[PDB]
């Protein structure tokens, strides 16, 4: 084999963030899409908005694009949280 194109990003939010502002979810989604567009063609972008670990997945067209994304985002700060970015393990669901 698998040449991984999917990036799993964590700690981007906590689901309570969307409890009292119905606009934050779409703002975070767009923030991520705009940034990730610089790394490669996005095939699919998902926010797991009820996952307690603040998870998003970004699928790219090429594995090099996923690599560039992981290199740039892992350990970066987002909205006051330090995020992780890693290649999908191919098994875990969110």
């Amino acid at each position: 084999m698998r040449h991984e194109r999917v990036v799993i990003i964590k700690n981007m939010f906590h689901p309570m963030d969307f409890e009292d502002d119905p606009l934050v979810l779409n703002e975070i989604r767009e923030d991520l899409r705009v940034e990730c567009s610089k790394f490669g063609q996005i095939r699919k972008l998902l926010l797991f908005d009820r996952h307690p670990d603040g998870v998003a997945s970004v699928s790219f067209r090429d594995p090099e694009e996923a690599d560039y994304c992981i290199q740039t985002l892992d350990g970066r700060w987002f909205g006051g949280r330090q995020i992780t970015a890693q290649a999908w393990d191919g098994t875990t669901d969110y």
Binding site: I28, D31, V34, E35, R76, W77, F78, G79, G80
Partner: peptide, 7 residues
């Protein structure tokens, strides 16, 4: 955007 915002 929220990129690079610290606590």
């Amino acid at each position: 955007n929220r990129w690079d915002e610290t606590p």
